[PDB]
Write a protein that holds these residues in place. Sequence first.
Motif, PDB file in Angstrom:
ATOM      1  N   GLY A  16       0.842  -1.209   0.000  1.00  0.00           N
ATOM      2  CA  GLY A  16       0.000   0.000   0.000  1.00  0.00           C
ATOM      3  C   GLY A  16       0.873   1.254   0.000  1.00  0.00           C
ATOM      4  N   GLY A  17       2.137   1.164  -0.386  1.00  0.00           N
ATOM      5  CA  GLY A  17       3.107   2.226  -0.344  1.00  0.00           C
ATOM      6  C   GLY A  17       3.728   2.452   1.029  1.00  0.00           C
ATOM      7  N   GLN A  18       3.385   1.650   2.044  1.00  0.00           N
ATOM      8  CA  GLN A  18       3.836   1.821   3.400  1.00  0.00           C
ATOM      9  C   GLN A  18       4.884   0.744   3.752  1.00  0.00           C
ATOM     10  OE1 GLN A  18       1.673   2.903   7.532  1.00  0.00           O
ATOM     11  NE2 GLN A  18       1.240   0.774   6.805  1.00  0.00           N
ATOM     12  N   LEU A  19       5.957   1.128   4.437  1.00  0.00           N
ATOM     13  CA  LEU A  19       6.941   0.179   4.914  1.00  0.00           C
ATOM     14  C   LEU A  19       6.492  -0.484   6.186  1.00  0.00           C
ATOM     15  CD1 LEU A  19      10.181   2.249   4.303  1.00  0.00           C
ATOM     16  CD2 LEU A  19       9.012   0.629   2.788  1.00  0.00           C
ATOM     17  N   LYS A  20       6.711  -1.795   6.253  1.00  0.00           N
ATOM     18  CA  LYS A  20       6.394  -2.623   7.405  1.00  0.00           C
ATOM     19  C   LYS A  20       7.465  -3.671   7.582  1.00  0.00           C
ATOM     20  CE  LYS A  20       1.274  -2.512   7.644  1.00  0.00           C
ATOM     21  NZ  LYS A  20       1.334  -1.864   8.974  1.00  0.00           N
ATOM     22  N   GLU A  21       7.597  -4.241   8.772  1.00  0.00           N
ATOM     23  CA  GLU A  21       8.432  -5.398   9.027  1.00  0.00           C
ATOM     24  C   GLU A  21       7.599  -6.674   8.875  1.00  0.00           C
ATOM     25  OE1 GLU A  21      11.810  -5.662  12.252  1.00  0.00           O
ATOM     26  OE2 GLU A  21       9.909  -6.367  13.147  1.00  0.00           O
ATOM     27  N   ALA A  22       8.155  -7.695   8.289  1.00  0.00           N
ATOM     28  CA  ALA A  22       7.487  -8.972   8.154  1.00  0.00           C
ATOM     29  C   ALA A  22       8.478 -10.139   8.282  1.00  0.00           C
ATOM     30  CB  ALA A  22       6.726  -9.045   6.829  1.00  0.00           C
ATOM     31  N   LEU A  23       7.938 -11.273   8.644  1.00  0.00           N
ATOM     32  CA  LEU A  23       8.656 -12.506   8.854  1.00  0.00           C
ATOM     33  C   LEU A  23       8.543 -13.409   7.642  1.00  0.00           C
ATOM     34  CD1 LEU A  23      10.057 -14.216  11.149  1.00  0.00           C
ATOM     35  CD2 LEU A  23       7.780 -15.066  11.665  1.00  0.00           C
ATOM     36  N   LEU A  24       9.666 -13.841   7.075  1.00  0.00           N
ATOM     37  CA  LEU A  24       9.654 -14.831   5.989  1.00  0.00           C
ATOM     38  C   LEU A  24       9.320 -16.187   6.599  1.00  0.00           C
ATOM     39  CD1 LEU A  24      12.834 -13.702   4.040  1.00  0.00           C
ATOM     40  CD2 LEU A  24      10.451 -12.914   3.728  1.00  0.00           C
ATOM     41  N   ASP A  25       8.197 -16.781   6.168  1.00  0.00           N
ATOM     42  CA  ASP A  25       7.586 -17.886   6.903  1.00  0.00           C
ATOM     43  C   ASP A  25       7.284 -19.072   5.985  1.00  0.00           C
ATOM     44  OD1 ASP A  25       6.124 -19.438   8.554  1.00  0.00           O
ATOM     45  OD2 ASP A  25       4.749 -17.857   9.261  1.00  0.00           O
ATOM     46  N   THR A  26       8.233 -20.012   5.872  1.00  0.00           N
ATOM     47  CA  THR A  26       8.036 -21.138   4.967  1.00  0.00           C
ATOM     48  C   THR A  26       6.941 -22.090   5.433  1.00  0.00           C
ATOM     49  OG1 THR A  26       9.854 -22.318   6.018  1.00  0.00           O
ATOM     50  CG2 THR A  26      10.422 -21.053   4.079  1.00  0.00           C
ATOM     51  N   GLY A  27       6.555 -22.032   6.701  1.00  0.00           N
ATOM     52  CA  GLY A  27       5.441 -22.827   7.203  1.00  0.00           C
ATOM     53  C   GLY A  27       4.075 -22.231   6.974  1.00  0.00           C
ATOM     54  N   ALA A  28       4.005 -21.071   6.315  1.00  0.00           N
ATOM     55  CA  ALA A  28       2.755 -20.435   5.962  1.00  0.00           C
ATOM     56  C   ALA A  28       2.460 -20.618   4.485  1.00  0.00           C
ATOM     57  CB  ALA A  28       2.796 -18.941   6.279  1.00  0.00           C
ATOM     58  N   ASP A  29       1.292 -21.162   4.162  1.00  0.00           N
ATOM     59  CA  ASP A  29       0.847 -21.233   2.785  1.00  0.00           C
ATOM     60  C   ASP A  29       0.590 -19.837   2.232  1.00  0.00           C
ATOM     61  OD1 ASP A  29       0.633 -24.073   3.283  1.00  0.00           O
ATOM     62  OD2 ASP A  29      -1.546 -24.008   3.253  1.00  0.00           O
ATOM     63  N   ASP A  30       0.024 -18.978   3.081  1.00  0.00           N
ATOM     64  CA  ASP A  30      -0.512 -17.683   2.754  1.00  0.00           C
ATOM     65  C   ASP A  30       0.179 -16.566   3.519  1.00  0.00           C
ATOM     66  OD1 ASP A  30      -2.579 -19.079   1.237  1.00  0.00           O
ATOM     67  OD2 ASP A  30      -3.350 -19.687   3.094  1.00  0.00           O
ATOM     68  N   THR A  31       0.096 -15.368   2.975  1.00  0.00           N
ATOM     69  CA  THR A  31       0.629 -14.139   3.538  1.00  0.00           C
ATOM     70  C   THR A  31      -0.441 -13.444   4.352  1.00  0.00           C
ATOM     71  OG1 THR A  31       2.253 -13.950   1.779  1.00  0.00           O
ATOM     72  CG2 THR A  31       1.560 -11.880   2.847  1.00  0.00           C
ATOM     73  N   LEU A  38      -5.778  -0.458   3.219  1.00  0.00           N
ATOM     74  CA  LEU A  38      -5.122  -0.935   2.024  1.00  0.00           C
ATOM     75  C   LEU A  38      -5.990  -0.646   0.837  1.00  0.00           C
ATOM     76  CD1 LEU A  38      -2.648  -2.555   0.914  1.00  0.00           C
ATOM     77  CD2 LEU A  38      -3.941  -4.614   1.319  1.00  0.00           C
ATOM     78  N   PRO A  39      -5.495   0.042  -0.187  1.00  0.00           N
ATOM     79  CA  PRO A  39      -6.272   0.204  -1.393  1.00  0.00           C
ATOM     80  C   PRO A  39      -6.392  -1.144  -2.107  1.00  0.00           C
ATOM     81  CG  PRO A  39      -4.512   1.827  -1.283  1.00  0.00           C
ATOM     82  CD  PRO A  39      -4.218   0.744  -0.276  1.00  0.00           C
ATOM     83  N   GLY A  40      -7.590  -1.420  -2.520  1.00  0.00           N
ATOM     84  CA  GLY A  40      -8.011  -2.601  -3.312  1.00  0.00           C
ATOM     85  C   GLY A  40      -9.348  -3.133  -2.770  1.00  0.00           C
ATOM     86  N   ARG A  41     -10.092  -3.850  -3.606  1.00  0.00           N
ATOM     87  CA  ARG A  41     -11.251  -4.596  -3.209  1.00  0.00           C
ATOM     88  C   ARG A  41     -10.858  -5.817  -2.419  1.00  0.00           C
ATOM     89  NH1 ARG A  41     -13.432  -7.023  -6.716  1.00  0.00           N
ATOM     90  NH2 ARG A  41     -11.821  -6.709  -8.353  1.00  0.00           N
ATOM     91  N   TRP A  42     -11.748  -6.256  -1.494  1.00  0.00           N
ATOM     92  CA  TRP A  42     -11.451  -7.369  -0.651  1.00  0.00           C
ATOM     93  C   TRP A  42     -12.701  -8.194  -0.468  1.00  0.00           C
ATOM     94  CZ3 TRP A  42     -14.188  -7.705   3.983  1.00  0.00           C
ATOM     95  CH2 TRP A  42     -14.740  -6.527   4.468  1.00  0.00           C
ATOM     96  N   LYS A  43     -12.462  -9.444  -0.070  1.00  0.00           N
ATOM     97  CA  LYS A  43     -13.557 -10.357   0.225  1.00  0.00           C
ATOM     98  C   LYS A  43     -13.326 -10.979   1.603  1.00  0.00           C
ATOM     99  CE  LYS A  43     -11.602 -14.003  -2.789  1.00  0.00           C
ATOM    100  NZ  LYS A  43     -11.668 -14.627  -4.165  1.00  0.00           N
ATOM    101  N   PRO A  44     -14.398 -11.229   2.330  1.00  0.00           N
ATOM    102  CA  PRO A  44     -14.246 -11.813   3.654  1.00  0.00           C
ATOM    103  C   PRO A  44     -13.834 -13.271   3.578  1.00  0.00           C
ATOM    104  CG  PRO A  44     -16.552 -11.418   3.157  1.00  0.00           C
ATOM    105  CD  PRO A  44     -15.811 -10.973   1.998  1.00  0.00           C
TER     106      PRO A  44
END
Lengths: 99, 99
Positions: A16-31, A38-44
Amino acid sequence: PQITLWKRPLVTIKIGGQLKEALLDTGADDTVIEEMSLPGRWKPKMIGGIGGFIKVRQYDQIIIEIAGHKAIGTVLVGPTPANIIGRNLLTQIGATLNF
Amino acid sequence: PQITLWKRPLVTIKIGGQLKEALLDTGADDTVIEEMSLPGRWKPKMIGGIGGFIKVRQYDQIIIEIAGHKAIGTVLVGPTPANIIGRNLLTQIGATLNF
Ligand SMILES: CC(C)CN(C[C@@H](O)[C@H](Cc1ccccc1)NC(=O)O[C@H]1CO[C@H]2OCC[C@H]21)S(=O)(=O)c1ccc2c(c1)OCO2
Protein backbone atom coordinates in the motif's frame (compact mmCIF):
# COMPACT_ATOMS: atom_id res chain seq x y z
CA PRO A 1 20.58 -13.08 -0.14
CA GLN A 2 21.38 -16.20 1.82
CA ILE A 3 19.60 -15.93 5.20
CA THR A 4 20.68 -18.01 8.15
CA LEU A 5 18.24 -18.77 10.91
CA TRP A 6 19.92 -17.95 14.23
CA LYS A 7 17.63 -14.91 14.34
CA ARG A 8 14.13 -14.44 13.03
CA PRO A 9 14.18 -13.84 9.22
CA LEU A 10 12.68 -10.39 9.39
CA VAL A 11 12.65 -8.13 6.35
CA THR A 12 11.20 -4.81 5.32
CA ILE A 13 8.19 -4.94 3.00
CA LYS A 14 6.28 -2.21 1.18
CA ILE A 15 2.53 -2.69 0.93
CA GLY A 16 0.00 0.00 0.00
CA GLY A 17 3.11 2.23 -0.34
CA GLN A 18 3.84 1.82 3.40
CA LEU A 19 6.94 0.18 4.91
CA LYS A 20 6.39 -2.62 7.41
CA GLU A 21 8.43 -5.40 9.03
CA ALA A 22 7.49 -8.97 8.15
CA LEU A 23 8.66 -12.51 8.85
CA LEU A 24 9.65 -14.83 5.99
CA ASP A 25 7.59 -17.89 6.90
CA THR A 26 8.04 -21.14 4.97
CA GLY A 27 5.44 -22.83 7.20
CA ALA A 28 2.75 -20.43 5.96
CA ASP A 29 0.85 -21.23 2.79
CA ASP A 30 -0.51 -17.68 2.75
CA THR A 31 0.63 -14.14 3.54
CA VAL A 32 -1.06 -12.53 6.54
CA ILE A 33 -0.58 -8.87 7.49
CA GLU A 34 -1.89 -6.92 10.49
CA GLU A 35 -4.91 -4.66 10.17
CA MET A 36 -4.17 -1.63 8.01
CA SER A 37 -5.83 0.56 5.44
CA LEU A 38 -5.12 -0.93 2.02
CA PRO A 39 -6.27 0.20 -1.39
CA GLY A 40 -8.01 -2.60 -3.31
CA ARG A 41 -11.25 -4.60 -3.21
CA TRP A 42 -11.45 -7.37 -0.65
CA LYS A 43 -13.56 -10.36 0.22
CA PRO A 44 -14.25 -11.81 3.65
CA LYS A 45 -12.34 -15.04 4.41
CA MET A 46 -11.18 -17.22 7.27
CA ILE A 47 -7.73 -18.61 7.86
CA GLY A 48 -6.54 -21.11 10.45
CA GLY A 49 -3.21 -21.37 12.23
CA ILE A 50 -1.80 -23.17 15.24
CA GLY A 51 -4.44 -21.87 17.65
CA GLY A 52 -7.64 -21.83 15.55
CA PHE A 53 -9.30 -19.61 12.97
CA ILE A 54 -9.54 -15.88 12.44
CA LYS A 55 -11.48 -13.64 10.10
CA VAL A 56 -9.46 -11.78 7.47
CA ARG A 57 -9.94 -9.48 4.50
CA GLN A 58 -8.64 -11.18 1.38
CA TYR A 59 -7.06 -8.80 -1.12
CA ASP A 60 -6.04 -10.27 -4.44
CA GLN A 61 -3.36 -9.08 -6.81
CA ILE A 62 -1.71 -6.69 -4.37
CA ILE A 63 1.70 -5.22 -5.21
CA ILE A 64 4.16 -5.96 -2.42
CA GLU A 65 7.91 -5.50 -2.32
CA ILE A 66 9.81 -7.93 -0.08
CA ALA A 67 13.39 -7.04 0.86
CA GLY A 68 13.57 -5.25 -2.46
CA HIS A 69 12.00 -8.00 -4.58
CA LYS A 70 8.65 -7.55 -6.31
CA ALA A 71 5.63 -9.74 -5.86
CA ILE A 72 1.98 -9.30 -6.81
CA GLY A 73 -0.51 -11.62 -5.15
CA THR A 74 -2.92 -12.36 -2.40
CA VAL A 75 -2.63 -10.74 1.02
CA LEU A 76 -4.86 -11.62 3.97
CA VAL A 77 -5.31 -8.69 6.38
CA GLY A 78 -6.50 -9.31 9.92
CA PRO A 79 -5.60 -9.76 13.59
CA THR A 80 -2.46 -11.86 13.19
CA PRO A 81 0.18 -12.04 15.92
CA ALA A 82 2.84 -11.29 13.28
CA ASN A 83 3.16 -10.03 9.71
CA ILE A 84 4.13 -13.20 7.79
CA ILE A 85 5.15 -13.68 4.19
CA GLY A 86 3.98 -17.12 3.12
CA ARG A 87 4.77 -19.39 0.21
CA ASN A 88 2.32 -17.69 -2.19
CA LEU A 89 4.75 -14.74 -2.29
CA LEU A 90 8.04 -16.51 -1.35
CA THR A 91 7.72 -18.49 -4.58
CA GLN A 92 7.37 -15.19 -6.54
CA ILE A 93 10.66 -13.85 -5.24
CA GLY A 94 12.42 -17.17 -6.02
CA ALA A 95 12.99 -18.33 -2.45
CA THR A 96 14.14 -21.85 -1.64
CA LEU A 97 15.27 -23.65 1.49
CA ASN A 98 18.75 -25.11 1.34
CA PHE A 99 20.74 -27.41 3.67
CA PRO B 1 19.37 -30.45 -0.71
CA GLN B 2 17.22 -27.69 -2.07
CA ILE B 3 13.62 -27.77 -0.85
CA THR B 4 11.06 -26.13 -3.11
CA LEU B 5 8.26 -23.77 -1.86
CA TRP B 6 5.73 -24.57 -4.60
CA LYS B 7 4.47 -27.15 -2.10
CA ARG B 8 4.72 -27.37 1.69
CA PRO B 9 8.34 -28.02 2.69
CA LEU B 10 7.65 -31.39 4.29
CA VAL B 11 10.43 -33.79 5.16
CA THR B 12 10.63 -37.03 7.09
CA ILE B 13 11.75 -36.83 10.69
CA LYS B 14 12.53 -39.45 13.31
CA ILE B 15 11.62 -38.67 16.90
CA GLY B 16 10.89 -40.98 19.83
CA GLY B 17 11.53 -43.95 17.57
CA GLN B 18 8.77 -42.90 15.12
CA LEU B 19 8.87 -41.50 11.58
CA LYS B 20 6.71 -38.44 10.94
CA GLU B 21 6.36 -35.79 8.23
CA ALA B 22 7.11 -32.23 9.35
CA LEU B 23 7.37 -28.72 7.95
CA LEU B 24 10.72 -26.93 7.70
CA ASP B 25 9.40 -23.68 9.13
CA THR B 26 11.45 -20.47 9.13
CA GLY B 27 8.57 -18.67 10.82
CA ALA B 28 8.73 -20.88 13.92
CA ASP B 29 11.09 -20.09 16.80
CA ASP B 30 10.45 -23.48 18.34
CA THR B 31 9.77 -27.03 17.17
CA VAL B 32 6.24 -28.31 17.73
CA ILE B 33 5.23 -31.94 17.31
CA GLU B 34 1.78 -33.51 17.30
CA GLU B 35 0.70 -35.27 20.46
CA MET B 36 2.90 -38.31 21.16
CA SER B 37 3.95 -40.12 24.34
CA LEU B 38 7.58 -39.11 24.77
CA PRO B 39 9.26 -40.39 27.91
CA GLY B 40 10.66 -38.31 30.70
CA ARG B 41 10.20 -35.02 32.40
CA TRP B 42 8.70 -31.96 30.73
CA LYS B 43 7.65 -28.40 31.60
CA PRO B 44 4.30 -26.78 30.71
CA LYS B 45 4.37 -24.06 28.05
CA MET B 46 1.90 -22.01 26.00
CA ILE B 47 2.70 -20.93 22.42
CA GLY B 48 0.72 -18.56 20.27
CA GLY B 49 -0.02 -18.11 16.60
CA ILE B 50 -2.93 -17.32 14.32
CA GLY B 51 -6.04 -18.13 16.28
CA GLY B 52 -4.49 -17.89 19.72
CA PHE B 53 -2.52 -20.12 22.06
CA ILE B 54 -2.18 -23.86 22.63
CA LYS B 55 -0.87 -25.75 25.65
CA VAL B 56 2.21 -27.87 25.02
CA ARG B 57 4.74 -29.96 26.92
CA GLN B 58 8.32 -28.81 26.67
CA TYR B 59 10.91 -31.62 26.43
CA ASP B 60 14.59 -30.75 26.41
CA GLN B 61 17.52 -32.56 24.80
CA ILE B 62 15.34 -34.64 22.48
CA ILE B 63 17.14 -36.50 19.70
CA ILE B 64 15.56 -35.87 16.32
CA GLU B 65 16.70 -36.75 12.80
CA ILE B 66 15.53 -34.34 10.07
CA ALA B 67 15.80 -35.58 6.45
CA GLY B 68 18.78 -37.65 7.50
CA HIS B 69 20.49 -34.91 9.51
CA LYS B 70 20.91 -35.42 13.26
CA ALA B 71 19.76 -32.77 15.71
CA ILE B 72 19.18 -32.54 19.44
CA GLY B 73 17.19 -29.91 21.29
CA THR B 74 13.95 -28.71 22.71
CA VAL B 75 10.70 -30.09 21.33
CA LEU B 76 7.19 -28.94 22.25
CA VAL B 77 4.47 -31.59 22.14
CA GLY B 78 0.75 -30.98 22.02
CA PRO B 79 -2.41 -30.53 19.93
CA THR B 80 -0.78 -28.79 16.99
CA PRO B 81 -2.41 -29.29 13.57
CA ALA B 82 1.06 -29.59 12.01
CA ASN B 83 4.47 -30.96 12.85
CA ILE B 84 6.75 -27.90 12.74
CA ILE B 85 10.54 -27.87 12.68
CA GLY B 86 11.52 -24.48 13.98
CA ARG B 87 14.70 -22.45 13.94
CA ASN B 88 16.13 -24.07 17.07
CA LEU B 89 16.67 -27.22 14.96
CA LEU B 90 16.91 -25.69 11.46
CA THR B 91 20.13 -24.01 12.50
CA GLN B 92 21.57 -27.36 13.60
CA ILE B 93 21.09 -28.89 10.17
CA GLY B 94 22.54 -25.89 8.41
CA ALA B 95 19.38 -24.65 6.75
CA THR B 96 19.15 -21.28 5.00
CA LEU B 97 16.52 -19.39 3.09
CA ASN B 98 17.84 -18.19 -0.25
CA PHE B 99 16.57 -15.77 -2.91
C1 LIG C 1 2.35 -17.42 12.72
C2 LIG C 1 3.86 -17.58 12.91
C3 LIG C 1 4.48 -16.28 13.42
C4 LIG C 1 4.15 -18.70 13.90
N1 LIG C 1 3.72 -20.03 13.49
C5 LIG C 1 4.49 -20.68 12.45
C6 LIG C 1 3.80 -20.61 11.09
O1 LIG C 1 4.75 -21.00 10.08
C7 LIG C 1 2.56 -21.47 10.96
C8 LIG C 1 2.80 -22.97 10.98
C9 LIG C 1 1.53 -23.77 10.84
C10 LIG C 1 1.30 -24.55 9.72
C11 LIG C 1 0.08 -25.22 9.60
C12 LIG C 1 -0.86 -25.17 10.58
C13 LIG C 1 -0.66 -24.36 11.71
C14 LIG C 1 0.56 -23.67 11.83
N2 LIG C 1 1.86 -21.14 9.76
C15 LIG C 1 0.70 -20.45 9.72
O2 LIG C 1 0.07 -20.02 10.69
O3 LIG C 1 0.32 -20.26 8.44
C16 LIG C 1 -1.03 -19.78 8.23
C17 LIG C 1 -0.98 -18.85 7.03
O4 LIG C 1 -0.93 -19.74 5.90
C18 LIG C 1 -1.68 -20.90 6.21
O5 LIG C 1 -0.88 -22.04 5.94
C19 LIG C 1 -0.58 -22.77 7.11
C20 LIG C 1 -1.56 -22.27 8.20
C21 LIG C 1 -1.95 -20.89 7.71
S1 LIG C 1 3.08 -20.99 14.67
O6 LIG C 1 2.81 -22.28 14.08
O7 LIG C 1 2.00 -20.22 15.25
C22 LIG C 1 4.28 -21.23 15.93
C23 LIG C 1 5.26 -22.17 15.75
C24 LIG C 1 6.29 -22.39 16.66
C25 LIG C 1 6.36 -21.48 17.68
C26 LIG C 1 5.38 -20.51 17.87
C27 LIG C 1 4.32 -20.35 16.99
O8 LIG C 1 5.65 -19.82 19.02
C28 LIG C 1 6.84 -20.31 19.48
O9 LIG C 1 7.28 -21.34 18.67
